[PDB]
Every structure is written in C-alpha cells, then in structure tokens.
Amino acid sequence: SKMNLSEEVDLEDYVARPDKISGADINSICQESGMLAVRENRYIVLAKDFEKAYKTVIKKDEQEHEFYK
Amino acid sequence: TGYDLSASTFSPDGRVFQVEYAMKAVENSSTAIGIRCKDGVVFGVEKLVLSKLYEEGSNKRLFNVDRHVGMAVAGLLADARSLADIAREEASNFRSNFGYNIPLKHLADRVAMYVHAYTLYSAVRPFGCSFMLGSYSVNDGAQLYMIDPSGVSYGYWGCAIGKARQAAKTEIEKLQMKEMTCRDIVKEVAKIIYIVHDEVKDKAFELELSWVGELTNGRHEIVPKDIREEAEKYAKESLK
Amino acid sequence: AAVVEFQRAQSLLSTDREASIDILHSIVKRDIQENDEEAVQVKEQSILELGSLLAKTGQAAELGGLLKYVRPFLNSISKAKAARLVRSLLDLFLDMEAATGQEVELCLECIEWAKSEKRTFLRQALEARLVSLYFDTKRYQEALHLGSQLLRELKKMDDKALLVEVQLLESKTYHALSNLPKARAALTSARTTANAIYCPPKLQATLD
Amino acid sequence: GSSAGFDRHITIFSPEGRLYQVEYAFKAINQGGLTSVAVRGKDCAVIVTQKKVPDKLLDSSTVTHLFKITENIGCVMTGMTADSRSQVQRARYEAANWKYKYGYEIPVDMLCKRIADISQVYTQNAEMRPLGCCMILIGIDEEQGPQVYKCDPAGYYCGFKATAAGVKQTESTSFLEKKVKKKFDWTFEQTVETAITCLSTVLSIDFKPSEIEVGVVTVENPKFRILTEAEIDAHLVALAER
Amino acid sequence: GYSFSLTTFSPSGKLVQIEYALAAVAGGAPSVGIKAANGVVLATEKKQKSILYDERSVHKVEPITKHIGLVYSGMGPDYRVLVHRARKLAQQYYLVYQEPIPTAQLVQRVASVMQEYTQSGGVRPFGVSLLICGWNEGRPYLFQSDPSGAYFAWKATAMGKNYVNGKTFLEKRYNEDLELEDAIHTAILTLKESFEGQMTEDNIEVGICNEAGFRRLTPTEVKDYLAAIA
Amino acid sequence: AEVKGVCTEAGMYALRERRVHVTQEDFEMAVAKVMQKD
Amino acid sequence: EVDYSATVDQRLPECAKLAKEGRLQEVIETLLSLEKQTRTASDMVSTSRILVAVVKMCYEAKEWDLLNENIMLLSKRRSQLKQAVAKMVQQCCTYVEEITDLPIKLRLIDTLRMVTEGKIYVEIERARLTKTLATI
Amino acid sequence: LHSLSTG
C-alpha cells in the first residue's frame, strides 16, 4: 500500500505460492521489487519486477527429492 | 569415518572414495604415454628397474590384447595383467562371434564396462590400474583411448598415465601430432619419457616402445631394437 | 456442429445479450442422440452460459423454466456434472434478488432431486439456502422447522461451517418473531460453534 | 538429520525415514560439473549439454554425453561418466529386448520406467550403490508426440515439458518454467533456441559451436540425430542476431 | 547379495527398520481411502513442484485388475515395484483359477511380499503404505498394507502426511450409508484439509471402484467433483 | 490445567465485552477456544 | 564505445530523401536495423537521432498509425537507452502541439502517455502531455 | 499385464 504499484501486479500470484516465508521475507520481496523498479529509472513497480524480486529473495534450494513422495 | 571402506558406499558429497584410492594407486606408478599420430599410435613406457636382478623385459607394461590393439598400463601390475587378459578374451569373443577384428571403440567400451562393474559392490574392489588401448586400421584410422579405475574411457590424441602425467601432458601438447608420422613420434615419445623421468628420484629406467600403424599394416608390435636405440639416442641428446 | 453455434453465441456476447440468448436457447432445446460425447459437453456448457447470461438479463421465466426443463437432461450426464449444473442454476436464481415467488418451490424441487440422487452434502447446502429463502419470504415457522432439522443433521456430521450459518439464520428468524431470549440463545450457539473453528471473513462479518 | 547405525553407509532407512545413500548418489550427479537441458516442443524434443574439453590432447569427438539408445530414442547423461555408460548400455539392451520380445519400438516412457525399476533395486539392496547418473531420454511417440523423461538415481521418473539436470539444474528449471508459463507451442527452431538460451543464460558462457552438443527428434523424421557444429552454429548465429 | 537380515529386533522388542519405513510413509503425500455402500474411492495429492513435470505422465492411482486398484503413500519407486508385483500376482491367480483375484487375496499376497522384504537378507522394507480397493461378491473392499506386511480392512482411512487428523476427520464425517459420489466428496474434503494451496483437477488423483470395476477418474471428472466442493 | 485455562479464558471473554460478571456464554466460548481451536 | 557518429550522418539524409520519395516501411526497417546496431553499441547520440528521425519521418508523411506503432515499438526495444526515448518523446510532444485534428492528436497523446507511464526520465513530458490532454 | 504397464 505504501509503494506505487501498477494495476497489472496481482499479489495473489505470490501469496498463493507454498513458500514458508516470514513477514521480513515479504518486506524484502517488496523492497527488491522497488529496487528493480529504481534500477530501470522507474517510479512504478511492474509485475516483472515483483516476479524477479520474489525469485531473488526466496532463492529456495529444492532440498526435497521427489522420490520421497 | 567409514565412508571409504567400500565401493558401494557414497560419501556425503557424492564421491566413491574407493575408486579415488584406486586412482591414487595409478598416480603412484611410473609414467606411460601414448601419442596418436597421423598414421598410427605409439606407446612409450618408463619402466623402472627396481633392481639390476630383473631381466630386460620383466614387468612388461606394454601388452598385446589383440593382433591390432596394444595396451599400455600404469598402476597395480597384477590388476593390469588381469585387465589385459579381460581385454584379450573380449577381443577373442568379438572375433569368434562377429568374425572380424574388434574396433578399438568397442573394445574400450567393453573393457571399461568390465572395470566399472568393480566400482559398485562391496564384494570386490576397483581395479588399481589405468590403461591406454591403441590401434590402427585403414578404415577406422588411428585410435587411442584411456580407461581409468572408475571405468571412464576417453579417446585421445596424446595421453599419459602415472606420477609424471601432468608434465608428460605438457610436453605432449608441444607436439603437432596430427601431422607427423610414427617414425618421428617414436623419437618424440622417447624425448618426452626421458624429460619427465626423475633421475634424482627413482632412477635407472628402461624405455619400452611399441606402435601400431600403417607401417606395421595395422599390427601392434614392439618397436624394432634399431629404431628404439635411435630414439633413445635422440632423447638422450635432447637433454643436453 | 453445435460448437460453431457456441462460438457464434460467444461472438454475440459483445452484441446484445438477448441476441446470444437465441443461440444458447436453441442449443439447449436441441434434442440429443444416445451419447454424442461432443454434443453433451456443448449442451451443458450452453446451459451454464445461458444461465449466466440470464443472471444479468434478469429473465425470471427463462431462468426458472431452465431448471424445471433440464431435469430429464440431468439423467444423461454424469452425477457430478448434474449436481454442478443444478447448484449453478439454483445459485444463479437465488443470487438474483428478484422474488419471483417460486424460489421456494424450485429449491424444494432441487432438494427432492438431491434426495432421489442421495447427495447429502448437496441436499444440506440446498436446505440451508431454503432456510434463507424462508426467512427472506417471511415464512418464519417453516424456517425454524427446517433449521432445526438441518441443525441436528449438521451437528451429527460436525460441519461447523454450515452449522454456524444455520444457527445464525435461526437467530435471525427468532429475532424477526420478536423472541429475544431464543434469538440470543441461537446467537450464542452460533458464536460458540464459530469460535470452535476458523471463520471466513464473510461468515465472521455475518456473525458480528 | 538423525542417524542410527549404518543408515548412512547402506540403503536402509534413517530414523526420520530417509535414504541417505540415495541422496548422496543424487549429489554425485553434480560431480561432473556439467548441466544438461531438455526442452519439448509441439512436434520436436531437444537435448543440449555443455561439452568440456580441458586440453587439446583430448579427442573432442569422443567427449559426448549424448547417446543414441535407439534410432527413435536419444538420451543425455549427467553425472558419473562410467555410471552414465552403464545406464546407456542397459537402456540399449532393454530397448533391443523390447523390440525382440514385442515386435515394436519401445515407448520412451516405458524405457525410463524399466531403467528406474532397475535403479530402484540399487536403493533397496544394500550390496550395491545407486548409479550416480541421471538419464534424460527424448523421443517421438506414435500418438503422444514428443516425449522427454528425466530418470534419476532413486528410481523416480516423470515426463517433462522441459527439464534439466546437473550442477545448474535448479536455475535452468526456473528459466524453463518462466518460459513455459508463457504457454507457446514452440517450433523446432524455437525449441533449439530456447534450450541453448537456457543453458547460456544460466551458465553465462555465450556459447561457441564447439562447447555444446545438441540432439533433436522431430515428428517429420522420428529419429535421433546429433547436430553438427555447422548446424549448431546456425542456431547460435540466429540467437546472436536477435 | 547379502544373506543376513537388515531388519532385526531391538532390545525393546521392536522391528526398528519397519518403524523407520513407517516414518518414511508418514512423510509421503496424503492419501485417503473411503469405502461407500456402492463402491470405494481412493484419492491422493498428486502435486508437483513445478509446471515442467508432466502431470499425466505418471499416475499415483494405478489399476491392478479390471476391479482392483492401488494408491500409495510413501516412496514412488517402491510403489511402482509393488504395483508390478501385485499385477504379476493377479496374473498368476487368474491363470491358475481363470477368475480375477479377490481383493482380499491380492492384499494378502502383496502383504506377504512386503513382509518378505522385512526378513530377507540384504534388503530394506518397502517405504510405502498401500490402499487397495476392489469389488467382489457385489460388495466393496478397502484394505491398507503397511511396510511391515500387515493388512487392515478399513471402512475409511488416511495415510501419509497429516494422516492422524485425516483419520479424525473421517471419524466425524463417515457413515456406512454413504454413496459413492458422497464418498468422493468426503475424500476430496479430507485431502483439502491436509492440502496446502488450491486443489486443481491436475494436482490430485482420484480413482473409484464399483460394480463396473476400477477406473481412475479423468481430470475433467475431478474438475467437476472439485467445483462441487466450492 | 485445560479446565483452569478454560476458566481464565471465560474471564477474558467477559473482559472483551467490558463485563464484570462471567456468564455461561463466556464459559462456552472459552471451552470452544481452548479445546477445538487449540 | 564504437562511436558510429558519421555512420548515421551518412544514412539519415539518404533515408529522408527516400521517405520523401515514398519509401517508408523499407526505410523505417533500415533505420530499425541501424537503431539495433547503435543500441547494442550503446551510442546515445546516434540512437537519439535515429529515433527522432524515425518519428519525424512518420509525422511529416502523415503516417499516424505508423507513427503510433513506431513509437510503441521503439519505446519497447530491448535495453533501450533512456535518453534516446526521452529525446524521441520530447520531439513527439511538439508534433502533438502542432497537430490540430482532435482524434489524431488524442490517439497520439494516449500513445505518448502510455509509453512514458512510470518512467522518471520522461516524467516531465508525461506531465505536460497530461496537462495538454486536460486542456483538450 | 503388458497393457497395464504401458497403458
């Protein structure tokens, strides 16, 4: 709510993800989205910025082999 | 720690340490090189004499697994001879079944798989020898493969196995092997073997030379004594 | 065949809704052979889309006659698809706030169909909707009776989510009867059952 | 990560129900330092893998992780080279046995199903270790079309629209997932370019037509062919010019 | 191969390796088996970690005969091995008797194999629990075979991750008068309680056995049953 | 201990409505919160 | 970098003459190739002139649809230089001011305000353009 | 058997 987002960004895309992340992780995701927006000389955060920020912040190694289930 | 006592046990980093120890056994032996030139393959072995009592020809590290294939070994000589017999029987079976000389690619892929069969179970240990199979034919051409204790067979232009493998490879890289013939490659192999030899360390080596090429009609034979002595003289002169 | 008419109706969606209504109604009124695996999915999709459009055009006659007319058709498609179609059509009629006067009638018809098909969960949902309809149609006594039956049935199966809604409906019905003690008791039961579980924001807002 | 007895030395269950030997076999795949990427298109399947030739002495014609299991089925191996050759030989034998016993070419799904059944025994019997290799088979099916199947040391197996194995398996998987989300049935050239772009972007190499091997299968010719350096160079130039 | 048993009796009289195989089972994907009055339903969470995995390439609910099907919770490859074993045993029974194997007999033979793997030399117990559904004598049959080789006749049960709460849910949501469609509804609800995220027609696998035999539901039918949930 | 916690939670529910005397509804809500929710 | 400089100096008058002759789509394709070369070369002064010449070409020829499509494509090129887009928009708002036809001016304003949305380097133009739109 | 394995 404090960031100048674009209407093309749907937060439910990243909310529905099964990653077990904390509130600081969410704040870091939004912060890196703003960071990527700033890098390209933009004052509005697009959906690609949020996708890249989520991938960067989560950076979760799989750590679980599929044969176990 | 218990992670290296068997070949059927993986290390927490995903490495079979028994195979690596078998590789170190190869790295503890004298250097044997092999160069695939334009019209054949030449094998050279720095066969040290541990005592003057052994006759000239004992512990032959150059084998004949077939009439057109030669084998240069490095590491445990007992395992080397066992693998030489395995390759001999593989070539014999190929000839008795399909009716023609076994291609070097197929012989390498078969003996390498026999070697790999010893790197999976705790009932056996990996072979402690690495060997190069070299051959020549008018159709296939000059071929040179190296197989390590793990069972990885790779084709080569110039290869070396032993404790001076890196220095031998550095000396080999200087050669323009893809253009010169066997008659020059024998001299250069002698030069490389003499260069990588350490006289202050284990000394009194013998140069074991063999080749297989069009000048031998695709037959692996020991290099004739006159040519071997000429190559030895050239190698000694190259050391100044 | 009918897929071309479905695409034509989809194109007519940009045009007048009633214009596409002709295509969808012609597809629905179309008779079908034994199986017609392609035609049955197209017919079901046409029924669903025509109901969706009538949910905006607000044609009580067409939407109401759809449910009473496709009843033979429900015996051809699979039970899951039939139940989904019944739920969608009845929900679209009930969300349309126009009190045409036959909401209770066709809700009871769907309840009878669910009883015939032995679909207990569907029947319970339809009975809760019927209690809501009874409250919205000033039929407080029938609402209380059906709410008591549904309350016992949902208590047996530990369906707290629907139990809270039925208890709230009973509390509203008793408040409409100016029976404050019974309405307070029903509200207390609803609040305790809601406390026993997680309430979605809609249910929590209704309870509050 | 609890342990009790020899649960880290043989394929027996740990206190929490884990086979540590199988996981170590999985870690053995990255020992080779190579990454393979397979991408499935609307009418083709492509396997690409980096080929590393440290010195000119090595015969680059023999360093090939692309193996022709059958005429219509190809594979790319990631992990221990000797175990890779073992799995390739076993797959070739199983394909030939299927052709002999049943009279028709073995389906790609069933080939890796049999291979994974073979490798599952290694994870149940304690006298052998699992093969530290991963097979990715690609082939054109009669009806299902292109098929890509990864085939891991644990005996797990699944079909894939686009998969990857090796050191950079996860980054390549993320890249291919992002590409697939766009939902484009890529043509042959598009699939080859997508695989090459995945490998290049993940590795940041800007490939030359001597550092990667590409093997393709297409519906028009349902045979596995390894692209020559000129054919790979054509795709590399096409990627560079855009 | 090793000739000595890898499963032994602990001083407390427990087959420890069997308990560890059960622990591996409890970490698998949730599976629910519900026996209705007119059939049985086997549901499982066939959720992948990426869209790249082909959902229809491998099926967790696999048929054994025209009237018997399995769904596992545990390790995939072990379930594939046990599926092949169950199919082979069914073929042997059919060849001997010229009649499809009864569900109970197949469960007994499969459990015998799983027990053999708890006593034989150099092998570990199967890390899977098998839910076996069948139809015989006009009656539905549901069984669960654990890694130890013990088989139980279940009216309704849940295995895998979050299976205890699934069982408790099934106690308060199952009655013997349930119909097959309501059984599918209840099984989907049981999966949903242990499910994280949303259940699509592709990330769960449902199969049903009735008088017509055993058949795994196509994704479209699962989509309709899931739309019935919401 | 759970019964004692139920009593304290009934008092807490009485507090949340700014009431002085704990009622039976407070006890039932406390039972639901302590047992079912937790 | 490579400093094309005179390379675009030779090209621009030639393509301008061809555009006056009647060849535009082929000419704008040639300038697209040259813009790709300059943008990969990261030549700010050359890319800005290329974009300005392109938009001027589409404006003088009254190719309103082509002008809008060219603006959309040029603003969306991969790794485009921000100053080149800034100069292009600064040249296009002058055409906006010059145009008196209300529908054409409105469509051009919409395109310019949609290519400049959320970008700092063209925040002033999208401001002034917005003001113009408000006046309209 | 063969059909069950293949499908």
Side-chain angles (χ1 to χ4, degrees), chain D residues 17-43:
Chain D
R18 292 172 61 196
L19 302 164
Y20 283 117
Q21 276 303 310
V22 186
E23 308 184 15
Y24 303 159
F26 272 93
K27 304 194 62 51
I29 306 173
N30 309 3
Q31 287 291 321
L34 287 191
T35 308
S36 325
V37 158
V39 190
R40 169 165 72 101
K42 60 172 312 301
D43 59 76

Side-chain angles (χ1 to χ4, degrees), chain B residues 134-147:
Chain B
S135 167
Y136 180 91
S137 60
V138 53
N139 301 343
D140 301 13
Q143 281 170 113
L144 168 68
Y145 283 72
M146 181 246 308
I147 312 193

Side-chain angles (χ1 to χ4, degrees), chain A residues 32-65:
Chain A
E32 297 292 333
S33 323
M35 273 318 252
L36 299 152
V38 163
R39 167 190 313 166
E40 310 207 8
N41 214 20
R42 284 195 311 260
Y43 60 87
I44 284 187
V45 189
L46 289 302
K48 52 159 188 173
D49 311 341
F50 254 93
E51 188 65 36
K52 215 178 315 182
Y54 196 94
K55 267 191 208 273
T56 296
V57 168
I58 263 48
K59 204 47 38 163
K60 180 249 181 174
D61 178 39
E62 56 70 57
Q63 295 284 352
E64 59 224 346
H65 302 94

Side-chain angles (χ1 to χ4, degrees), chain C:
Chain C
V3 196
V4 193
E5 308 145 7
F6 191 95
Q7 272 87 231
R8 254 162 76 259
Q10 194 269 343
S11 73
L12 282 187
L13 297 183
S14 72
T15 87
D16 315 334
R17 340 178 191 177
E18 206 266 287
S20 184
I21 287 313
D22 315 83
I23 324 290
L24 303 142
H25 234 306
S26 51
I27 294 207
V28 171
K29 288 153 172 159
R30 196 166 189 170
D31 285 354
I32 317 297
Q33 296 209 9
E34 208 288 318
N35 50 348
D36 318 66
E37 202 32 80
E38 152 202 359
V40 278
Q41 322 147 277
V42 172
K43 179 172 190 187
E44 175 268 281
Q45 206 31 252
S46 70
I47 291 184
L48 192 139
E49 277 288 339
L50 154 81
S52 73
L53 294 197
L54 302 164
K56 311 113 172 187
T57 78
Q59 301 166 17
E62 300 261 49
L63 198 299
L66 203 46
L67 177 48
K68 291 204 55 174
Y69 154 66
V70 306
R71 171 66 52 89
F73 173 66
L74 306 165
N75 326 328
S76 57
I77 47 177
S78 48
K79 307 182 192 174
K81 300 192 54 51
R84 180 185 184 177
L85 210 47
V86 166
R87 193 93 208 257
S88 312
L89 292 196
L90 185 122
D91 268 37
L92 278 207
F93 191 32
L94 296 196
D95 298 333
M96 270 204 336
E97 266 295 334
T100 87
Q102 36 174 1
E103 292 79 15
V104 162
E105 174 212 5
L106 53 64
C107 209
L108 248 179
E109 287 318 297
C110 283
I111 284 173
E112 294 302 320
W113 179 81
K115 289 179 177 173
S116 86
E117 297 278 80
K118 313 203 177 185
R119 307 288 267 97
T120 58
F121 304 92
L122 174 56
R123 180 195 41 83
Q124 286 163 4
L126 298 185
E127 280 180 329
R129 269 292 200 182
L130 189 51
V131 173
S132 198
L133 291 184
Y134 279 159
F135 182 75
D136 293 359
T137 51
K138 317 290 186 169
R139 323 251 282 278
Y140 301 134
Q141 289 76 48
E142 299 161 7
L144 293 175
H145 179 39
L146 185 56
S148 290
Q149 293 183 346
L150 200 47
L151 217 82
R152 301 180 308 166
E153 204 188 342
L154 295 178
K155 278 214 64 213
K156 273 163 40 67
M157 65 156 33
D158 202 82
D159 189 13
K160 313 244 186 185
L162 208 42
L163 193 45
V164 170
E165 299 179 14
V166 180
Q167 266 154 347
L168 279 170
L169 286 164
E170 226 188 20
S171 175
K172 295 200 317 175
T173 317
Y174 273 127
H175 178 32
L177 295 184
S178 306
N179 196 314
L180 231 47
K182 286 205 177 182
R184 172 61 101 185
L187 171 67
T188 294
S189 308
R191 282 190 77 236
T192 60
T193 309
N195 226 39
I197 51 157
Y198 151 76
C199 303
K202 178 179 179 173
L203 182 58
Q204 192 41 240
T206 300
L207 192 85
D208 283 336

Side-chain angles (χ1 to χ4, degrees), chain G residues 34-132:
Chain G
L34 193 47
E35 182 269 342
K36 195 172 185 178
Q37 295 177 351
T38 50
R39 173 171 33 97
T40 46
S42 173
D43 197 1
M44 203 251 281
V45 312
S46 294
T47 324
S48 312
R49 295 173 47 188
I50 291 184
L51 306 187
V52 160
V54 164
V55 280
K56 155 188 327 169
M57 190 198 306
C58 315
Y59 168 62
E60 253 75 14
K62 266 44 185 166
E63 307 285 339
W64 307 127
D65 292 5
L66 280 178
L67 184 43
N68 298 150
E69 299 328 276
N70 287 8
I71 285 170
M72 287 302 347
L73 181 129
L74 288 182
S75 63
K76 280 160 129 14
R77 304 280 270 181
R78 171 166 295 168
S79 304
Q80 241 296 340
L81 304 165
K82 68 157 199 172
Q83 302 96 1
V85 188
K87 302 279 195 169
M88 158 181 149
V89 170
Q90 283 157 1
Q91 255 290 345
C92 281
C93 56
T94 63
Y95 308 148
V96 166
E97 300 186 7
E98 294 169 343
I99 288 167
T100 45
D101 193 20
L102 254 287
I104 287 298
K105 184 171 173 166
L106 276 193
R107 197 201 153 179
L108 181 52
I109 285 184
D110 284 21
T111 299
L112 263 182
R113 278 178 72 258
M114 212 191 42
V115 305
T116 52
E117 154 183 338
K119 295 158 180 174
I120 288 186
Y121 45 92
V122 277
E123 70 189 355
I124 300 185
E125 328 297 324
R126 196 194 189 282
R128 294 171 177 170
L129 276 151
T130 292
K131 200 177 185 180
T132 294

Side-chain angles (χ1 to χ4, degrees), chain G residues 18-30:
Chain G
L18 311 177
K20 303 172 187 183
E21 199 259 9
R23 329 167 202 179
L24 196 135
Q25 296 83 356
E26 322 93 320
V27 158
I28 66 179
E29 186 166 349
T30 314

